[PDB]
């Protein structure tokens, strides 16, 4: 069984995406169907669901409206109209046979899925603010600084520290994506607390898709 | 209608997992169909167990006999059992069923097989810095790093009150030493910020709880 999802990509809020779902390996015609999609880091919800013969149609309460479900029989393809799309709309996008059998039913087989971002960006430089000490911390002589990089898009972000001459104990965490479209990111130092009155800390803030660049003190 | 599953469980090879799930009560888990599907890091969802009863079950394709269901009408609960944890086994698992045709999920159960030594999370909270706080804005970021398994909860709470919205909230990434790290972000206004005496990050590993706080003066 194969099912191939293809027809995703970046699209702005208020714009429309049509996902499309090849299928073999079964008699496609004689089944249903059914959506699925996952936002990044969260559990699976179900978006919509067409009968074997196309007749009936089903729309969670989030999409209803919005979406329209489609089969084309005689092509084997699955189809998802997405219309208004929305910040919440974001997310991997499964296929999956939806069967009838006598006394069940069940999600037997997924495709792999296609990504759907919806940024109301399309290339936005980062803001980038100190984190500064704050406290001792103590842990003898242990102190932890960093940078936070705010709202850029589209990834990614490096960081360094002191041009390169600061690696141990760096520690760049992987980026968040809010619902408003834009990453943020944070990279912390843990540094000796003696050396916080001698020391100078720069992080190297590079953000290739823009052409920005920031050294943040 | 709610499918309640626990956020995450750790065994260790060759021992036997027990994954619940709680249906509310509109609906009477002795009439329902079970649907567990596993998803691997990084894949699609694959159908891993349909239950019903005893009598009336069946396997999803390449799932070995080491696993099966069971029904607990009391607490009107849905069990998924393997036992000889195997390395292969360690996965999100989703409980579904069908309601009146709406196809309802629970929220994934993180089961790690242990591979490594425990190690409880190293949690540091960051304020918002003057410059943030002088553009009327507000970030606080919650550092989370050096745990496993590599799965936590992260709630906020604003002088000693959850806090509702406002919070993203990474998935854990594996890190260098093959321990995993996660980050929390808590977006106000600066006037949001002044309002309270204390912002709290609190984070959850395997039902022991860290609270760190911050203070705005």
């Known amino acids: 069984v194969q099912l191939v999802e293809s027809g995703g990509g970046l699209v702005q809020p208020g714009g429309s995406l049509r996902l499309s779902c090849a299928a073999s390996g079964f008699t496609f015609s004689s089944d249903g169907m059914s959506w699925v999609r996952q936002a990044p880091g969260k559990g699976l919800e179900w978006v919509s669901y067409?009968?074997?013969?196309?007749?009936?149609?089903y729309y969670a309460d989030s999409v209803k409206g919005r979406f329209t479900i489609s089969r084309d029989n005689s092509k084997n393809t699955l189809s998802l109209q997405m219309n208004s799309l929305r910040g919440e709309d974001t997310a991997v996008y499964y296929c999956?046979?939806?069967?009838?059998?006598?006394?069940?039913?069940?999600?037997?087989?997924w495709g792999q899925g296609v990504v759907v971002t919806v940024s109301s960006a399309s290339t936005k430089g980062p803001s980038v603010f100190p984190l500064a000490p704050s406290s001792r911390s103590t842990s003898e002589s242990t102190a932890a600084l960093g940078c936070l990089v705010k709202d850029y898009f589209p990834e990614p972000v490096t960081v360094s520290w002191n041009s390169g001459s600061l690696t141990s104990g760096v520690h760049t965490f992987p980026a968040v994506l809010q619902s408003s479209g834009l990453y943020s990111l944070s990279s912390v130092v843990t540094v000796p607390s003696s050396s916080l009155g001698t020391q100078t800390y720069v992080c190297n803030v590079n953000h290739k898709p823009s052409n920005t660049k920031v050294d943040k003190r | 209608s709610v499918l309640t599953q626990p956020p995450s469980l750790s065994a260790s090879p060759g021992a036997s997992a027990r994954l619940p799930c709680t249906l509310s009560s509109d609906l009477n888990v002795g009439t329902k169909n079970m649907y567990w599907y596993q998803q691997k890091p990084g894949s699609a969802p694959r159908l891993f167990l349909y239950?019903?009863?005893?009598?009336?079950?069946?396997?999803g394709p390449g799932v070995p006999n080491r696993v099966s269901g069971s029904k607990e009408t009391s607490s009107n609960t849905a069990f998924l059992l393997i036992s000889g944890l195997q390395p292969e086994d360690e996965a999100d698992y989703y409980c579904?069923?069908?309601?009146?045709?709406?196809?309802?999920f629970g929220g994934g159960t993180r089961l790690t097989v242990l591979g490594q030594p425990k190690a409880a999370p190293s949690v540091t909270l960051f304020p918002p810095s003057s410059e943030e706080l002088q553009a009327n804005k507000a970030t606080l970021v919650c550092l989370i790093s050096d745990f496993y398994p590599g799965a936590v909860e992260v709630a906020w709470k604003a002088d000693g009150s959850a806090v509702n919205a406002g919070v993203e909230t990474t998935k854990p990434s594996k890190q260098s030493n093959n321990k995993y790290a996660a980050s929390s972000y808590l977006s106000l206004t600066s006037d949001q910020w002044k309002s309270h005496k204390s912002y709290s990050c609190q984070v959850t590993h395997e039902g022991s709880t860290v609270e760190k706080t911050v203070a705005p003066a």
């Open positions: 579904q069923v069908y309601d009146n045709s709406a196809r309802v």
């Open positions: 239950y019903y009863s005893d009598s009336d079950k069946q396997l």
């Open positions: 999956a046979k939806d069967i009838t059998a006598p006394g069940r039913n069940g999600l037997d087989s």
């Open positions: 067409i009968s074997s013969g196309g007749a009936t149609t």
